[PDB]
Each structure stands twice: as structure tokens, then as C-alpha cells.
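During the second year of the project, the team shifted from modelling isolated chains to modelling whole assemblies. The rationale, set out in the original proposal, was that interfaces cannot be judged from single-chain predictions alone. As a representative example for this report, we include one of the complexes processed in the last quarter. Its constituent sequences, exactly as entered into the pipeline, are reproduced here:
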Amino acid sequence: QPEYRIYEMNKRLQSRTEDSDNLWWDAFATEFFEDDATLTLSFCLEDGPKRYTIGRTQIPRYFSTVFEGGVTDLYYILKHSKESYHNSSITVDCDQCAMVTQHGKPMFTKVCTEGRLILEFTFDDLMRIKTWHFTIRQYRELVPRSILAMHAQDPQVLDQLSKNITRMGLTNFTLNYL
Amino acid sequence: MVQPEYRIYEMNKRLQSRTEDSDNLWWDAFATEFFEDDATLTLSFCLEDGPKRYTIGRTQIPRYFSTVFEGGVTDLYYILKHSKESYHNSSITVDCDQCAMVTQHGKPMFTKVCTEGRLILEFTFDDLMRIKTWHFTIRQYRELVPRSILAMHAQDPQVLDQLSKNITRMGLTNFTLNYLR
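Output from the structure prediction step:
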């Protein structure tokens, strides 16, 4: 099953320690991405609609940068994923995907980066990703109710709690690298 | 030749593949597809002054998941981080001490409820791997509020006081406990 590979990846991301070197991320990409894999992200920030694409050797560094900002966990939620097979390719079209990154101290903010995700899988036993396209539409940010009690209390320092920490779902550490 | 916790993902896949008017026949087909005909579901927590353990059988399991969405909840999925499995001759047990039952509510505030706790599941070691025992011990629960609600409803500290007062009780909503008791 294709999404079973996506689940196996969700468990491996949870085995990521705060001391995961580049050697661990390379083993992470080699386990799910083909040697010729490419990753594409599309968003609409502010200078005009953009589109970036990285290669196989730049993929392990991409998933490394998402955690380089207080992010403790990363998993993908796939609502209503439409598959489509070929003779030697498996395409997974999920229009309701949410890249969830859970942050840590000081405010355990949860970010739900929603958008469309397309994946082309190889029809082998490794069944690794050959193409990763994630089109971003929106991002939903949530703050634990505990933080709204100790921090903010009520009317004050709401500008930190009313202003977003991420940009179009992705943090401020994954744009200068792109 | 397949890992048991994959059943939780296959279960998570159908919970979101649910319509707004799901009859009980669809929930019964959902239960027979993941639970044995003699399955049992257990919830353990420490609410009042002491332990409260509940247990229902196969015929009431699909109705338990019906109560989750009838409290304004629009989505429900389970996260199993650091899951310890266990194979035997005719049983497969999955012990996940760090599980989060995530329930997303709807209007007006769109609160996300993370009912966290220890989860144990006993799977049958046959060619279906359906659940025989579901025991979910609850330890904590966190509620998360969208920053958008805190932006427009930012003013006026009384919503900011209600945004610090929880809507659920120990993770489960006010509609799935009157049915449990």
C-alpha cells in the first residue's frame, strides 16, 4: 500500500532526536526516496507566486531544516487521498493534506500547514518516492489552552499570541535555505 | 506479513472518510472490519477522586465512535508515537504509552482536543488482524485554540477567560460520557 509507506515515514520522523546528525537524515531519505527523487513546494507568499525544487542530495537537508526552530514533531495527515497506479509508477493525489509541526518552549504552538500533496511512487519493493509536490493553500495555527492561562493571562502580550510564528505554514528557517 | 499499528492508520483513514449523516449501518460495517465479533473496548481514567474504568462489548463499539462526532466534532484520528508491539501464537498486542486521541470540533471556535494517554490493543494473529481488546488509559488532555479566534475575538478578556476554560472533561466531550456512565 502506498500510504503505508507514508505511515512508516510518520513513525520514523518520531524516532528523530534533537541530536540527529546529517548521517541520520541521509538514512531517512535513502529509506523513502529514490536516488533521483525531487521535492517541489508551491506557495503564494508576497513577491509573487513561487515554486521551488530540490534534488535527492538536498532532500535530507529539507526535512532537517523544519526541525531547526524548536519543532519537536512532524507528521502528515492524509484526508481523502486519491490514488492512481501505472505500469511502473504509483501516484497518490491527496487534496486534504496537513503538514503538522508541533513546536516546543516557550509556546507549544501547533501549526497545521494544509494543502494538496502529490506523490509519484515507484512500483518496486522499495516503493520509494520519486516526486514530491506539496502545493500550499493555507496554514492553521493553534495554541494550547494552558499557554493562554499562564502566558497572556488575559489582555496582555496578545500580539505574540495574535501574530503568527510561521510563514505560509513553513517556519522562518526553511526559506533562506530554499 | 504486515505490522499491526498499520491497522490504526487504516482505521484513521476511514474515520475521516465519514459523511455528516452516518447511519449506524456504516458504523457497524466499520466495527466488524476492525474488531472481532467478541471484541471489548475499555477506557480507564482517574477523574473523580479515584479510578474509573469502563468496558463495552462488540455491539456497543460502533456506537461509541458515533458519540464522538455528535458533540460538534468534525474529525477524529489517533496518533501512536513510540508503539511497542508484541507477537505470540494467537495474539498481537500493541502497547503505545504515548498516544493522542485528536478530535477536531466545528463552529464557533474550532477547538482541537488531544486526549493523551496509554493505549493497549490486542490484535488477532489471523489473516485479518482485527481488534480483540481495546484498552485506553487516559492521563492528560490538551485543548488548542486557533490563533484566528484569538485574533478577531482577541479583544474583551472574557472570551480570553473562556479561551482558558476547557469545553471537554478529561478529553472526552460532554456527549460521550453520559453514554459511558
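The beta strands of chain B are 35-45, 52-57, 73-84, 91-105, 112-124, 131-146. The longest strand of chain B covers residues 131-146.
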